């Protein structure tokens, strides 16, 4: 992968302005190729570790706190970053820059301040849950709560035709698995689509560092 | 799987899967009890109590706390012991026979001294 | 005055002792002090001690105080109930059910406890 | 620790407490009607018991095949379970006791046969691959004599074909609202038949053997129906006790969750005011 | 039938009243219909209440 | 009903002191009839808006805040 | 028991500085006998009422508090 | 159930005091049993009469806009 | 009723009542089935499907995507249409032909366009 990737590292021993300026340096390196017509992917491996460093250098510059002692412009801190990840028009050159920010949550609390600041910026989200991670489902993508906002216009047509009914089968399994925890033995059609959904779950598992092509 | 091996990894992940399913069943057990589980969830609970108690171990340092001399379990023997618990080989033993015990033969001899 | 100069046993009724604590919290918020646990003044236990350590029995007489407590949010671990309860000696739970039954006074016999019942 | 999540968990377990309390009340009413059916059945059972006593125990009369003890080549089993769940150990105690006796004294699949009453026992013996001849499924809450009459007639006539050579019943005896003990009762042959108070002699109008041939199946059918009414009463009492224990467990969960709710709302109030006064002190 | 000089009682498995040999068969044909209507009504009422309990404990398990 | 009703209004677009002084104007109009022997009903539609407006005035006057930043 | 014990009291009505220095006076009176070779028992009745008073004494010094508003 | 008037009874006229004190009890017995009436026959005479009178006093206490009813 | 009228208020209110009654039957329909639905509720689901499909329109905007020209439905005609669905006048029509139509005459013209 190092034939085409750039790794920007601002580590924990480095001062707080380097963790503050690491994603913006990554986006400037991405925009160099975006405004040449190339397609760039940018991954911020913890964007909730940028907010702590920006909180640090704001509170040490004697700026007043807010919720959870973050400053006022922490939404603007992430949104000024993430709105530079666009897909340009054909007059601008045609290049894009897709972003993948990460946010670590605390005990699954997606209603915290930095998760709800970054959820409201991105074009959808992918929920990784330990409750599904330790049930065998790895990758731990909660396919019900994970939203794609572009979705369908992103996919190719062959993925579209069959994902449209994958989603229905898996949503039916998620709805009817609740009535199979205890009790009184659901009938044959409901058990047929429970078996359909369990095989859907076994399809959607993968292993580590081996991606699959689209076909 | 590339570090601890394949068998170690499957035993570890199946241990974690049964303990996660038992953690999911905690609320149904808390309100409605063991009575309504659908005969595989009863087996999940029945094995996960044994797995949760065979994670506990007597220490050399804890001899001053309890008088029990304490153990040193190699990796092959704890993988073999948890694999034999997952296979159903020790479902007949009581669950208090698995507490504070080094290897799985000591589970057998402690259940023997309990009177099973 | 009637405890000291007269030397007799005096009752001292404080209706809603919680209003004392929250008025202290309001005076502390007006005075500009940094708030303590929850919304209470830093001097919550000290103000409550300076109130309820003069309600004592001396060699002259006594002052015994019957006090009403609000217990906000149905929470007996809230600091304003929790610092009053460190000074109480008896509780007389008045119940609606015993009042509708025809029992006067409506003191719930099982809920009412006392430190002196020994 | 997620004050809103604690309050949603409190409201969910209050809703489960309400639902299990409603099911407790429904099972109290059904227990009342089941013990009314038992006390309406009891004079028929008293009269047929004293008639069977005076006939089969007076002046010999042991010539009938349901009085003699024949050597057992097979052994029937009549298991009375519930159709519906949410009883605690109504079904499981009976099915475990039947499984223990069959695996303890037969060790052969052709040496026994099982007659289930209920879907729970039927699915139990189909999971464990045991032969089940008669099946009866989906009884009412308050069963009358007709449905159990056809299956009890099939059971006693299948004893009369020379198949079973003996059979046992297994049900839950309604001792109290809490107990529901499990009884093993031997249905046929009628060897343990007890004598009544006033042993009277009848004039058997065709003969005693013909009236035994027509009457002892009706005594066995009345035994099956009395056991089934006792089992339905113990079923509704067990579901009543199970839902009472469910409401008690739910209410204990409510009080521990309100303790956690009070700790979390206290932490939320002090955390928010520490933030507000820190933002106020930051300006000076 | 067992007859004593004051105990001429009759033990019948099904005893109608309407003084005709086939009215017990007609009553059995009506009560079989009423009986399987009740046998379905009791089962669907239990399964409705059990669906209420299963959804209410679903929401408890989701609430975590 | 407008033969015997007085209406006092302070909208959301009005300044926060008018929101703060609306109910005191209400009782100032009511006490004049109360101390003449008449009977008055005074209706305070959303005093929580008055609480928010006096919170706003005390915080812009930088009086020290309390619980939920109310003074 | 008063032939060998010492009672060090700082009651509920006393100011928070005397509540803050009661246990330190307890060990300071115990270590006189500890470092002479004797054996000393020291009982602290309600150290949570020491922690509350140090919370008071530090919030009045305007020190920024942590969990449960403790310093 | 949650609302309260701390004057109430001293406020009402004499014709309302005789009649409102049992509608309070009917609403109490109905709102404690409203969640138990979706399924099952609880009791045929003692509980269903409470549910009947409660489901009718809920319909008594409903009004529409701008039609105040005199206390008579 | 002061703002919309009395007829509009009672029609929209009965629509809300039958849709609430259909929402509180969803677990019963999805698990137990349509056959166990205890009729005088099967009529509720029969009318509520036709109501919740008649709530959808063909938009003028979506003409470019579907070809269907789009409609502007006044309030008197939609109150009359939902009143005629609540009266049971169009229970004989299929469950479709309410999808993506403007008025209630378009329902019967689309239903006879499908042979009904």
């Amino acid at each position: 992968a190092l034939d085409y990737t750039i790794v920007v590292t601002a580590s924990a021993s480095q001062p707080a302005p380097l963790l503050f300026l690491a994603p913006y340096a990554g986006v400037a390196m991405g925009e160099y190729f975006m405004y040449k017509g190339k397609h760039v992917l940018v991954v911020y491996d913890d964007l909730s570790k940028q907010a702590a460093a920006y909180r640090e250098l704001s509170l040490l510059l004697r700026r007043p706190p807010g919720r959870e002692a973050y400053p006022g412009d922490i939404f603007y801190l992430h949104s000024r970053l993430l709105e530079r990840a666009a897909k340009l028009s054909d007059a601008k050159g045609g290049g894009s820059l897709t972003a993948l920010p990460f946010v670590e949550t605390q005990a699954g609390d997606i209603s915290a301040y930095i998760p709800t600041n970054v959820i409201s910026i991105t074009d959808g989200q992918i929920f990784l849950q330990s409750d599904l991670f330790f049930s065998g489902v790895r990758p731990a993508i909660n396919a019900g709560l994970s939203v794609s906002r572009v979705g369908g216009a992103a996919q190719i047509k062959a993925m579209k035709k069959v994902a449209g009914t994958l989603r229905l089968d898996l949503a039916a399994y998620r709805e009817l698995e609740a009535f199979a925890q205890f009790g009184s033995d659901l009938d044959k059609a409901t058990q047929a689509k429970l078996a359909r959904g369990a095989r859907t779950v076994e399809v959607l598992k993968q292993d580590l560092h081996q991606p699959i092509p689209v076909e | 799987p590339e570090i601890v091996g394949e068998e170690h990894y499957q035993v570890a992940r199946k241990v974690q899967q049964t303990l996660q399913r038992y953690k999911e069943l905690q609320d149904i057990i808390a309100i409605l009890g063991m009575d309504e589980l659908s005969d595989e969830d009863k087996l999940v609970v029945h094995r996960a109590r044994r797995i949760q108690f065979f994670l506990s171990q007597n220490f050399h340092v804890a001899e001053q706390f309890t008088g029990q001399p304490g153990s040193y379990v190699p990796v092959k023997e704890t993988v073999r012991g948890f694999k034999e618990i997952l296979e159903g080989k020790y479902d007949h033993l009581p669950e208090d026979a698995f507490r504070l015990v080094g290897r799985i033969e000591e589970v057998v001899e402690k259940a023997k001294a309990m009177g099973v | 005055y009637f405890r000291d100069e007269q030397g007799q046993d005096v009752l001292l009724f404080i209706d809603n002792i919680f209003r004392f604590t929250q008025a202290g919290s309001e005076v502390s918020a007006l005075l500009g002090r940094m708030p303590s646990a929850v919304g209470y003044q830093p001097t919550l236990a000290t103000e409550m001690g300076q109130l309820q350590e003069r309600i004592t029995s001396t060699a002259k007489g006594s002052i015994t105080s019957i006090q009403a407590i609000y217990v906000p949010a149905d929470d007996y671990t809230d600091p304003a109930p929790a610092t009053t309860f460190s000074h109480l000696d008896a509780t007389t739970n008045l119940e609606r059910k015993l009042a509708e039954m025809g029992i006067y006074p409506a003191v719930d016999p099982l809920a009412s406890t006392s430190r002196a019942l020994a | 620790a997620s004050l809103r999540d604690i309050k949603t968990r409190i409201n969910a377990t209050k809703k489960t407490s309400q639902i299990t309390k409603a099911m407790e009340m429904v099972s109290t009413s059904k227990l009342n009607r089941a013990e009314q059916n038992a006390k309406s059945f009891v004079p028929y059972m008293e009269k047929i018991q004293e008639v069977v006593a005076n006939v089969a125990l007076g002046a010999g009369g042991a010539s009938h095949p349901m009085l003699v003890s024949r050597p057992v080549k097979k052994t029937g089993y009549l298991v009375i379970t519930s159709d519906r769940g949410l009883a605690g150990a109504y079904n499981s105690n009976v099915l475990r006791l039947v499984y223990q006796t069959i695996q303890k004294r037969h060790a052969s699949p052709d040496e026994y046969a099982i007659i289930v009453i209920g879907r729970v026992g039927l699915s139990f013996f189909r999971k464990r691959n045991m032969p089940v001849i008669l099946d009866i499924t989906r009884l009412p809450d308050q069963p009358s004599f007709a449905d159990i009459k056809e299956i009890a007639r099939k059971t006693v006539g299948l004893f009369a074909d020379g198949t079973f050579d003996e059979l046992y019943m297994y049900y839950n005896h309604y001792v109290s609202a809490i107990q529901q003990e499990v009884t093993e009762r031997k249905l046929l042959p009628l060897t343990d038949l007890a004598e009544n108070k006033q042993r009277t002699v009848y004039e058997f109008e065709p003969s005693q053997e013909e009236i035994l041939d027509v009457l002892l199946p009706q005594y066995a059918e009345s035994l099956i129906y009395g056991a089934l009414l006792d089992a339905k009463a113990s079923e509704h009492a067990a579901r009543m006790t199970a839902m009472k224990n469910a409401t008690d467990n739910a209410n204990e969960l409510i009080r521990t969750l309100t303790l956690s709710y009070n700790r979390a709302r206290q932490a939320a109030i002090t955390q928010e005011i520490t933030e507000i006064v820190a933002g106020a002190n930051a300006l000076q | 039938l067992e007859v004593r000089p004051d105990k001429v009682t009759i033990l019948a498995q099904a005893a109608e009243r309407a003084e005709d040999i086939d009215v017990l068969r007609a009553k059995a044909a009506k009560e079989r219909a009423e009986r399987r209507l009740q046998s379905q009504q009791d089962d669907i009422d239990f399964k409705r209440a059990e669906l209420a309990l299963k959804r209410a404990m679903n929401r408890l398990s989701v609430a975590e």
Side-chain angles (χ1 to χ4, degrees), chain A residues 159-172 196 200:
Chain A
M159 183 66 79
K160 191 189 294 183
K161 293 189 177 74
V162 205
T165 181
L166 198 166
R167 185 175 296 112
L168 296 173
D169 291 332
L170 190 62
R196 172 71 69 192
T200 305

Side-chain angles (χ1 to χ4, degrees), chain D residues 116-178:
Chain D
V116 295
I117 296 170
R119 289 189 289 112
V120 176
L122 184 142
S123 67
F124 184 83
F125 295 116
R126 286 191 291 112
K127 287 181 178 68
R128 284 166 172 81
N129 288 317
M130 290 185 181
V132 173
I133 298 172
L134 296 173
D135 58 354
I136 189 165
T137 292
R138 193 176 63 247
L139 294 179
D141 286 324
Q142 307 308 116
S144 65
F145 191 74
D147 45 2
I148 194 63
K149 184 258 184 295
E150 70 248 6
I151 191 168
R153 192 263 303 163
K154 290 183 184 293
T155 296
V156 177
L158 203 151
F159 178 77
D161 292 333
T163 303
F164 278 164
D165 296 333
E166 85 174 26
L167 77 157
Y168 296 95
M169 287 190 286
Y170 293 95
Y171 59 94
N172 290 106
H173 191 276
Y174 173 72
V175 177
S176 178
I178 305 169

Side-chain angles (χ1 to χ4, degrees), chain B residues 17-87:
Chain B
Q17 184 173 1
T18 61
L19 291 169
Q20 177 63 43
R21 187 84 270 276
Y22 177 59
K23 182 182 280 186
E24 290 176 354
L25 292 169
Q26 289 296 322
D27 286 328
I28 300 169
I29 296 166
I31 293 177
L32 296 174
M34 288 295 295
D35 296 327
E36 294 297 317
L37 297 177
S38 67
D39 205 4
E40 288 93 9
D41 293 330
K42 289 181 181 179
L43 188 65
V44 166
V45 176
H46 187 273
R47 292 169 184 267
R49 299 286 291 170
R50 311 291 166 88
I51 290 169
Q52 188 69 47
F53 287 158
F54 193 69
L55 289 168
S56 64
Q57 184 177 358
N58 52 357
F59 279 174
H60 300 284
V61 178
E63 186 179 1
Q64 65 186 359
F65 295 152
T66 36
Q68 192 175 4
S71 64
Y72 182 84
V73 186
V75 181
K76 301 294 188 291
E77 278 80 1
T78 182
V79 171
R80 182 182 62 83
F82 276 100
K83 188 176 180 180
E84 291 178 355
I85 293 170
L86 288 169
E87 286 175 354

Side-chain angles (χ1 to χ4, degrees), chain C residues 12-18 48 51-52 55 64-70 84 87-88 90-92:
Chain C
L12 189 272
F13 294 141
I14 301 172
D15 196 0
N16 204 359
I17 195 65
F18 174 72
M48 184 54 69
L51 178 64
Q52 281 174 349
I55 303 167
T64 169
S65 69
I66 315 297
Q67 295 171 356
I69 306 172
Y70 178 68
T84 56
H87 293 90
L88 262 65
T91 59
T92 60

Side-chain angles (χ1 to χ4, degrees), chain D residues 9 12-13 15-16 19-20 44 47-48 51 84-86 138 140-141 144-146 149 200 202 218 221 239, chain E residues 2-4 9 11-13 35 38-40 42-43 46 49-50 52-53 56-57 59-60 63-64:
Chain D
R9 188 171 175 85
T13 185
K15 189 69 174 67
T16 64
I19 292 176
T20 49
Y44 180 81
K47 182 60 69 178
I48 196 167
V51 170
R84 280 87 61 189
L86 288 171
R138 193 176 63 247
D141 286 324
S144 65
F145 191 74
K149 184 258 184 295
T200 63
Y202 293 106
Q218 295 187 359
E221 289 174 355
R239 186 174 295 115
Chain E
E2 68 95 20
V3 44
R4 298 187 66 85
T9 184
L11 299 175
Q13 289 179 353
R35 190 175 69 249
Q38 188 66 41
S39 176
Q40 292 180 357
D42 294 331
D43 197 3
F46 184 79
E50 193 179 8
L53 194 273
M57 194 166 288
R59 288 183 288 113
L60 181 66
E64 293 180 354

Side-chain angles (χ1 to χ4, degrees), chain B residues 97-108:
Chain B
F98 296 30
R99 292 175 181 267
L100 300 176
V101 161
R103 64 185 65 247
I104 200 70
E105 291 87 3
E106 300 181 357
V107 167
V108 176

